[PDB]
Design a protein around this nucleic acid. Structure first.
Ligand SMILES: [K+]
Ligand SMILES: [K+]
Ligand SMILES: [K+]
Ligand SMILES: [K+]
Ligand SMILES: [K+]
Ligand SMILES: [K+]
Ligand SMILES: [K+]
Ligand SMILES: [K+]
Ligand SMILES: [K+]
Ligand SMILES: [K+]
Ligand SMILES: [K+]
Ligand SMILES: [K+]
Ligand SMILES: [K+]
Ligand SMILES: [K+]
Ligand SMILES: [K+]
Ligand SMILES: [K+]
Ligand SMILES: [K+]
Ligand SMILES: [K+]
Ligand SMILES: [K+]
Ligand SMILES: [K+]
Ligand SMILES: [K+]
Ligand SMILES: [K+]
Ligand SMILES: [K+]
Ligand SMILES: [K+]
Ligand SMILES: [K+]
Ligand SMILES: [K+]
Ligand SMILES: [K+]
Ligand SMILES: [K+]
Ligand SMILES: [K+]
Ligand SMILES: [K+]
Ligand SMILES: [K+]
Ligand SMILES: [K+]
Ligand SMILES: [K+]
Ligand SMILES: [K+]
Ligand SMILES: [K+]
Ligand SMILES: [Mg+2]
Ligand SMILES: [Mg+2]
Ligand SMILES: [Mg+2]
Ligand SMILES: [Mg+2]
Ligand SMILES: [Mg+2]
Ligand SMILES: [Mg+2]
Ligand SMILES: [Mg+2]
Ligand SMILES: [Mg+2]
Ligand SMILES: [Mg+2]
Ligand SMILES: [Mg+2]
Ligand SMILES: [Mg+2]
Ligand SMILES: [Mg+2]
Ligand SMILES: [Mg+2]
Ligand SMILES: [Mg+2]
Ligand SMILES: [Mg+2]
Ligand SMILES: [Mg+2]
Ligand SMILES: [Mg+2]
Ligand SMILES: [Mg+2]
Ligand SMILES: [Mg+2]
Ligand SMILES: [Mg+2]
Ligand SMILES: [Mg+2]
Ligand SMILES: [Mg+2]
Ligand SMILES: [Mg+2]
Ligand SMILES: [Mg+2]
Lengths: 131, 147, 164, 97
RNA sequence: UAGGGGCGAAAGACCAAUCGAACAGUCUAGUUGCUGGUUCCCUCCGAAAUGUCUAUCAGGACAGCGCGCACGCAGAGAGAAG
RNA sequence: AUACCACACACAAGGGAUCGUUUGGCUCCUGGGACGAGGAAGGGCGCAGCAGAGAGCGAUAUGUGUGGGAGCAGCAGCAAUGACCACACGUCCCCGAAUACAGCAUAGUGCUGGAGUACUCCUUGGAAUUAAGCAUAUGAGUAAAGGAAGGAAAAGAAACUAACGAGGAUUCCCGUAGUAGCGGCGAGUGAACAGGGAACAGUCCAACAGUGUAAUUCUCAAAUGAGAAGUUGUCAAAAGGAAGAAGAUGUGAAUCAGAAAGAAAAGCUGAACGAUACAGGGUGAUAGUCCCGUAGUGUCUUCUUACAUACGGUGAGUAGCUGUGCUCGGUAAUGCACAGUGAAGAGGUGGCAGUGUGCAUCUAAGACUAAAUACAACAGGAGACCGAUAGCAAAGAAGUAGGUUGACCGAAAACAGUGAAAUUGUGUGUGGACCCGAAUGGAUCGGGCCCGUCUUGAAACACGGACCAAGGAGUGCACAUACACUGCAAGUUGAGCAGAGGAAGUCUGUGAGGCGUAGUGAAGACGGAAAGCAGUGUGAGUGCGACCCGAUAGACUUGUGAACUAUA
């Protein structure tokens, strides 16, 4: 049960809040679980998927496959994974997008600011965990 | 019964809704309100309301209800003001009850019926009828006038 | 108009007439509760309500009933040995418009003042009361009751001499 | 109807209270006396400086001829109240004497 | 020069296809004893177009004739005999 | 009937009903109530790499600083030398109160003007309508038109009620009461004190300021001088504080596998695990453990609020009176005005005109005041509400496309689902307008005028109806009433309001009033039969749009028109 009356439980309001999200709230939509080993290598339980990271598909047509993230579509919430595609009548191949939550991370791309992003989150935990 | 279907729901499919084909249901065939009473409605007034068209009586431009409000009790009910447990004590006991009508919001005593128990009683009130006084004195009781 | 009825008299002719609904009743009740609570903290050890006199009701219809009034008179306060400035400091209400015209009415209101003075307790600071765990009084102070009395009995020899 | 059951005699009864006497306020202090004196004095100076008004002249003339009832009627019509007329006649009479 | 106002060699003519009182918008869902319409099934009972009063005569009300619920109960839309 | 006309069935056309769905509407509650000469509200014009509309922004038309951190939706190019977002600031073209102006105050600086006006205050002031006609009266001191202010506004501490054994500012709720009364005494109108509560608070000016010295306010200088206002009278004292409330934001448990089958499992089957968290939303079908939250817990930032001096009893074109007009329930004047007339220092009132006299209660003609009460724009939360002919006019570039000379007027269009009927073509069958009864291998036999509606009377030479879908008309509230059902009963009751409670529900108090416990009279006065109260519903009367649609007309505006036509 919910006892805070400032938070809404309306279906109409929850749905609008989802689809009209922007900025950091949009980034929260692209989160995926880490594998059991990585959850010992790092403190975090889940992270936003980025290009170059390595993922196992755990639901759908392409179940059991593994591959590298090629692109991240923020407007239509989908991820393109290397080697997951369909062939047209022409023989031409189109990558099919997968929803973030159907993936699981196997190796992290550590290019750019990723190491600082991870550090910032670990500290935020401990700050309140140790109190 | 606590609930029942309405008549309007049975009249679906029947043309006139029960007002007649020749007479119909028009807006105000007889006039508005209680008007017409000396004219076309004279028969309703003379049958049910004969003392309507008149002026009568003495006039005071302001009256006060609190100064005139009163409530009346009969002698046959005096013993009834006491609780039933109390009644049953004073019936056998050697003592005389002292009843004050002011305490129950009664101010005038009337002479109706006979006293419930034929033993003495003291009655306090603002006014007594002549019959009431005679009945209370008959049993050796006493009437006390008070404000 | 047909049949037998009490003749109508329903006053709905005026087109400018306003309607007032009461859908807010439970919510406004909750607000009044929450305002009293917070007001009670601001003056923690002290009661929220002041002490008031007992007066007799107005007409012939209500003579025999007693009620709370607005404030004590300068004469009542003085007779009980207090001064007006002190009475205010201790939570007694004052009304300088009222007059005294009876012996009885004066004597009763003096008793209230002396009773109240006796039941009080004084503190140096708020923290002292907090540490003693004093629980603040709620509602009106020393309200009248006006119950119905009980039937008295009397011996036959007395009847001639007292008349109830 | 729970109205008009008692007679007027019994409605006139009353409970026997014990009364308190009224505190008389007759003493008037020194400073209050001088205050009243100065006000009455000031009223003299105005009358001395500016004199009587037209209807006051006409009124006083009638008093010399003993036209008492004419003066009464005249003053009633000027001031409105029969009480004010009775007072103003007495003040005018005293002024002439 | 503008609406109970204009303008008229006068026809009640003309004042934005509108004039014996313009247009726009509101009061206003103005009023109607008058015309039109008024949405499912089966079962049981079943009328009136007459009298009195009405600024009443295409309308009302009161009484008379229907139906529902029914306290109760020796009666009858027919004959004899005085 | 070879080919025309009709009907039935299958296939193809034609249209958009039905069912499934919804980032919209509506209603109630809570917060908020924030504009302008420092140029507003509203109008116009410019700004993109390819750019019409709309959104955003001003020639700085994506600049600066802080907190974050991954892409910029198409094509070409950009980006850890910071893509994109959030908070504040800087810049901010022309018209518009539009002002190089008008009126006005101070020693001086200045202030007003326009916008908005649901709610509050002050003026001015209708008619339709009801009376079965209509003129007084009603609708109504309402609509319309003007002036003005704030988050509320107005009111407010008795020249007050009352006749009790009396009370004691204003406002609001329950109530007295559809009563006392007003009224072609017709239709209809219509208050006050009490009694029970919410919230509570009182004070200022004049009359009346040190005379052994205006002690008072302001300016420049200076470290103690000059000057302005003022004797037609200036000047009557404290810092100070912790509480209370609202927001923003951090953290936050626990799952794997399988036959059959499907595009896809979260379903189904077995085995586990979390819970102070099974509110709700998202994921390719119905998820506590896949993602965002929730229960529980941390931080931080704003706002609100608090001690000093001196006094009383005469505030005038006023109160009142005569005439007059409007107004109120106010009745031989309830309130407000105008003209004549016009007080006393002592006066005003006690619901019916006058005169006298005791008694009770107050102090007008100067000012300020919290709380409890009302309601748009804008924000947040809820619902026995509506579901694209509905719900706001408007679920998309809606006050838009478009229209009036003008004031003003104003639409359609959801899913690239499903895919009804009217109506059309082709094929196959059966008939010559069709229905009811009864049949043949086969000619057919018998009965039937076109429905709805007013009417004594309709197949009518009475009216409405070409065809199909969808929408489309006895409802809600107040007041008496008769019946059926329910609890208690000489009594009865969910008045408002308080106490408890993770709460618009429920439980418990305190405690009025109303009707009943018996009637008669105009009244003084008198007294002697008959179960009631409160609900849940049904039939029926009256008032409000009042079963649905429909006049010719009447009024009101600080609204518009001489581009047609008349005359100077
Ligand atoms: K009904
Ligand atoms: K009927
Ligand atoms: K009909
Ligand atoms: K009449
Ligand atoms: K409560
Ligand atoms: K001409
Ligand atoms: K013409
Ligand atoms: K006209
Ligand atoms: K008629
Ligand atoms: K029959
Ligand atoms: K007739
Ligand atoms: K009848
Ligand atoms: K203004
Ligand atoms: K009429
Ligand atoms: K009529
Ligand atoms: K109106
Ligand atoms: K105010
Ligand atoms: K004021
Ligand atoms: K009062
Ligand atoms: K009270
Ligand atoms: K979690
Ligand atoms: K699975
Ligand atoms: K998923
Ligand atoms: K005064
Ligand atoms: K005057
Ligand atoms: K005052
Ligand atoms: K529309
Ligand atoms: K347009
Ligand atoms: K469709
Ligand atoms: K289709
Ligand atoms: K017809
Ligand atoms: K014919
Ligand atoms: K016809
Ligand atoms: K009705
Ligand atoms: K109409
Ligand atoms: Mg009829
Ligand atoms: Mg007829
Ligand atoms: Mg009497
Ligand atoms: Mg008395
Ligand atoms: Mg006939
Ligand atoms: Mg007819
Ligand atoms: Mg007429
Ligand atoms: Mg009128
Ligand atoms: Mg009126
Ligand atoms: Mg208006
Ligand atoms: Mg003074
Ligand atoms: Mg689903
Ligand atoms: Mg009037
Ligand atoms: Mg009077
Ligand atoms: Mg639908
Ligand atoms: Mg629509
Ligand atoms: Mg045109
Ligand atoms: Mg005929
Ligand atoms: Mg036709
Ligand atoms: Mg339909
Ligand atoms: Mg009543
Ligand atoms: Mg009886
Ligand atoms: Mg209608
Ligand atoms: Mg007329």
């Amino acid at each position: 049960m919910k006892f805070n009356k400032n938070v809404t439980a309306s279906r109409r309001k929850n749905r609008k809040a989802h689809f009209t999200s922007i900025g950091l709230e949009r980034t929260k939509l692209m989160n995926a679980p880490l594998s059991k080993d990585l959850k010992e290598e790092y403190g975090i339980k889940r992270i936003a998927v980025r290009p170059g990271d390595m993922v196992k598909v755990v639901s759908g047509e392409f179940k059991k496959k593994e591959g590298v993230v090629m692109k991240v579509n923020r407007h239509d919430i989908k991820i393109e994974v290397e080697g997951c595609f369909v062939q047209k009548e022409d023989g031409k191949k189109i990558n099919k997008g997968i929803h973030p939550s159907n993936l699981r991370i196997i190796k992290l791309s550590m290019e750019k600011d990723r190491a600082e992003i991870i550090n910032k989150k670990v500290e935020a935990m401990k700050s309140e965990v140790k109190a | 019964m606590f609930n029942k279907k309405s008549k309007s729901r049975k009249l679906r499919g029947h043309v006139s809704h029960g007002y007649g084909r020749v007479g119909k249901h028009r807006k105000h065939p007889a006039g508005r309100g209680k008007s017409g009473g000396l004219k076309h409605l004279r028969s309703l007034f003379q049958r049910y309301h004969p003392d309507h068209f008149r002026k009568l009586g003495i006039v005071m431009f302001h009256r006060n209800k609190n100064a005139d409000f009163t409530r009346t009790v009969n002698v046959s009910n005096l013993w009834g003001l006491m609780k039933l447990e109390e009644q049953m004590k004073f019936k056998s006991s050697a003592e005389v009850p002292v009843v004050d009508c002011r305490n129950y919001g009664y101010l005038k005593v009337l002479g109706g019926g006979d006293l419930s128990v034929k033993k003495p009683i003291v009655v306090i009130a603002r006014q007594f009828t002549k019959d009431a006084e005679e009945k209370i004195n008959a049993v050796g009781g006493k009437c006390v006038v008070a404000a | 108009m047909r049949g037998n009825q009490m003749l109508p008299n329903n006053h709905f002719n005026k087109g400018s007439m306003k309607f007032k609904n009461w859908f807010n009743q439970p919510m406004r009740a909750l607000k009044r509760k929450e305002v009293r609570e917070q007001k009670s903290k601001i003056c923690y050890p002290n009661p929220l309500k002041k002490l008031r006199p007992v007066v007799r009701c107005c007409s012939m219809r209500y003579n025999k009933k007693v009620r709370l009034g607005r404030g004590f008179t300068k004469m009542e306060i003085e007779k009980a040995g207090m001064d007006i400035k002190y009475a205010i400091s201790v939570g007694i209400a004052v009304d300088l418009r009222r007059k005294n015209k009876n012996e009885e009415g004066l004597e009763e209101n003096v008793k209230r003042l002396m009773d109240y003075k006796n039941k009080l307790k004084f503190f140096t600071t708020v923290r002292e009361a907090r540490d003693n765990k004093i629980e603040q009084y709620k509602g009106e102070i020393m309200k009248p009751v006006n119950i119905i009395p009980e039937v008295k009995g009397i011996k036959v020899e007395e009847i001639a001499t007292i008349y109830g | 109807m729970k109205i008009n059951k008692l007679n007027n005699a019994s409605k006139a009864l009353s409970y026997p209270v014990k009364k308190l006497a009224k505190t008389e306020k007759a003493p008037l202090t020194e400073k209050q006396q001088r205050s009243k004196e100065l006000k009455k004095f000031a009223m003299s100076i105005a009358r001395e400086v500016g004199g009587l008004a037209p209807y006051e002249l006409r009124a006083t003339e009638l008093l010399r001829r003993d036209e008492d009832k004419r003066c009464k009627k005249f003053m009633k019509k000027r001031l409105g109240s029969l009480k004010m007329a009775k007072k103003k006649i007495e003040l005018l009479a005293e002024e002439m004497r």
